[PDB]
Every structure is written in C-alpha cells, then in structure tokens.
Amino acid sequence: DFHEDLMTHCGIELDLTIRGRLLSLVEKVTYTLQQLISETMVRWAQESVIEDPELVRAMFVLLHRQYDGIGGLVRALPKTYTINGVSVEDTINLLASLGQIRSLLSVEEEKLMIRGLGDIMNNKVFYQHPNLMRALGMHETVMEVMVNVLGPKMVANCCRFLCYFCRISRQNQKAMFDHL
C-alpha cells in the first residue's frame, strides 16, 4: 500500500491547500541559457555545413536536452536518491568502491575486484537502502563483468554478489529476473 499511498499523494493536485504548494512548485520546476544553447547549435549548423559526424551527433544531444529540460530531468530522477544525514559516510566509501569497479570495468583485473566487491558485500548501506543499489545499476555493472569473463575465481565472487543482490528486496530481484 506504501507506493499506492504515495500514488494517492501523486494524484492529489492532478485534477487541501497542501496541494497549493505543489502547484506553485511545478510552475517553478519548469524553467537566458536555454535560448543561447539552442541558438548556438543553430548558429553552427547553418553556416558551416558540418562534417566530422561525431560533432553533429554531439550537437543535437544538447539541442534536445535543452529543449526537453523536463525529459532530461526525467531520466535523472530514477537514479536520484535521498539518504539520511547519518549514513552518508558509508555511501562515500561505497561510491569510492563502486567507482573502482566502474574503472576496473575497462580492463590483476581479477584481484582488485574481489577486494572491491567484498567491500560492497559489507557496507551498511547495501541492506538499508536496496533501492539505491538498483538506482546505481551496479548489478548490471557487476553482471557485465561476468559477461566479460564468460566467453575464473573472479566469477564466483560476482556470483556471490549477485545472489546477495537478490535477497535484499523484491523489486531489486526484478532486475535480475530479466537476465535469466
């Protein structure tokens, strides 16, 4: 019922003066930079018919992100997360652990992982906040490692992890269901 009670709160001012603070907030969320970021792409693309196709690809990503500054913000929101002020110190070293494995993704390769993943096995915020881990997508990161391996001892430590990923909640388990 918890997500549904949130969904009941979500359809509050969709159609309480508490609803009034929300409606004021959405207008504020909406929006000189958006003009010029738009314009300079149009400046470039007009005058100087553009080769190096990498550029052109780069331009319209900024063009669309600037026009859609809502959908840009859409994709950011499932990744974003609020932690309490207490357990911030575990999260710092977590991302420092995870940043090592994102780094080691592009690869002794075996060794530093197990130290890295074993750190993630033991963090306080792996239990208390499973929704943060799925927002990290780090299961897939770990998965892609054993994708990369499986064409040896390195594997099982990922597999010890990915099991241990499944236990902590059910929508956290959903993610792994897609890779059966």
Binding site: F2, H3, L6, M7, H9, C10, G11, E13, L14, L22, V26, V29, T30, S38, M41, V42, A45, Q46, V49, I50, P53, V56, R57, F60, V61, H64, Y67, D68, I70, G71, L73, V74, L77, P78, T80, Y81, T82, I83, N84, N131
Partner: protein
C-alpha cells in the same frame, strides 16, 4: 521512516507531474531547424541516414534517434 518516504515521493512525483504535455515545442523546433548550403534539419537527417547504412548487423538503441524521431513524429468544417 523519513528518508524512505522522501525517496518514494521522488519516484512518485516523477511518475505523476513531470509527464507533462508542455512539450509542444516540436513544431517550433522543426520550424527552427528549417532555416538557412544545407539546412540543419537536413544535416540532422543525413546524420542518421549515414549511420544506418553502416553494416552493424544489429542496430543499437541510439537515443539520439529515438529523440528526434519523436520530435518529428510530433511534427504532425
């Protein structure tokens, strides 16, 4: 709990009031790219075309295409 409630409010507020139909800009955009040599809109188009002609044998997600397709799809007693 508080941090948990602010968490699920975020995904709840994401799934409710950010799905806005305010996005009517597409008509103004595709007008705006259709200005002066080759126009930018043709540059955008040809970008995707020459991408597609590469024999990848499996196309990728290419969210660039996924965006400007939808712009151009929204481009239309």
């Amino acid at each position: 709990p508080r941090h948990r409630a602010v968490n699920l409010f975020l995904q709840g507020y994401e799934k409710s009031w950010i799905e806005t139909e305010e996005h009517y800009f597409e008509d103004k955009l595709i007008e705006d790219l259709a200005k002066p040599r080759v126009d930018p809109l043709h540059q955008l188009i040809l970008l995707f075309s020459r991408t597609a002609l590469t024999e990848k044998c499996k196309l990728e997600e290419d969210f660039l295409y996924m965006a400007y397709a939808d712009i151009m799809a929204k481009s239309c007693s």
